[PDB]
Amino acid sequence: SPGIWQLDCTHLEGKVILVAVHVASGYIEAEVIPAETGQETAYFLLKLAGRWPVKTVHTDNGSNFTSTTVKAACWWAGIKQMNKELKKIIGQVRDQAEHLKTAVQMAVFIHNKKRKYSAGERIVDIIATDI
Amino acid sequence: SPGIWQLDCTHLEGKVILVAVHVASGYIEAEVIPAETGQETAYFLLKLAGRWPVKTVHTDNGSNFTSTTVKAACWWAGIKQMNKELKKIIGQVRDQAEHLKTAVQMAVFIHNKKRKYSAGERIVDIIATDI
Ligand SMILES: Cc1sc(-c2ccncc2)c(C2=CCC(C)(C)CC2)c1[C@H](OC(C)(C)C)C(=O)O
Ligand SMILES: Cc1sc(-c2ccncc2)c(C2=CCC(C)(C)CC2)c1[C@H](OC(C)(C)C)C(=O)O
Ligand SMILES: [Mg+2]
Ligand SMILES: [Mg+2]
Ligand SMILES: [Mg+2]
Ligand SMILES: [Mg+2]
Ligand SMILES: [Mg+2]
Ligand SMILES: [Mg+2]
Ligand SMILES: [Mg+2]
Ligand SMILES: [Mg+2]
State how far the Cα of A5 lies from the Cα of B71, in Å rounded to an integer: 33
Pocket test for ligand 2, best of B98, B101, B108 (most atoms within 8 A of CB): B98
Residue B105 is nearest to which of A50, A101, A129, comparing CB atoms?
A50
Check: CB of residue A91 under 8 Å from CB of residue A69: no
Extended strands (E) in B14-83: 15-22, 27-33, 56-59
Identify how the structure was determined: X-ray
Pairing relationship of beta strands B4-12 and B56-59 according to DSSP bridges: parallel
How far B60 CA lies from chain A's nearest CA (Å)?
A: 24
CA distances for A83 relative to A9, A11, B35, B79, B91, angstroms: 9, 9, 31, 28, 39
CA distances for A13 relative to B43, B99, B125, angstroms: 20, 28, 39
Beta-bridge mates of residue B10: B17
Beta-bridge mates of residue A104: none
- Nearest Cα to A104, choosing from A23, A18, A41, A21? A18
* Cα angle B54-B58-B63, degrees, rounded to a multiple of 5: 125
Name the strands in the sheet holding A56-59, side by side, starting at the edge strand that comes first in the sequence.
A27-33, A15-22, A4-12, A56-59
**Side chain identity at residue A128, one-letter code:** A
Check: CB of residue B28 under 8 Å from CB of residue B111: yes
- Expressed in angstroms and rounded, the spacing between residue B35 Cα and the centre of ligand 9 is 23
Q: Around Cβ B44, how many Cβ atoms within 10 Å? A: 22
State how far the Cα of B47 lies from the Cα of B20, in Å rounded to an integer: 12
Pocket test for ligand 2, best of A36, A69, A74 (most atoms within 8 A of CB): A69
Establish whether residue B127 lines the binding site of ligand 1, counting it when its CB lies within 6 angstroms of any ligand atom: no
Hey, are the CB atoms on A112 and B50 less than 8 Å from each other? yes
Q: Which ligand number lies closest to the CA of residue B42? A: 1
Where do the domains of chain B lie, and which CATH numbers do they carry? 1-131 (3.30.420.10)
Check: CB of residue B122 under 8 Å from CB of residue B2: no
State how far the Cα of B65 lies from the Cα of B39, in Å rounded to an integer: 11
Dihedral pair phi/psi, residue A67, rounded to 5°: -60, 145
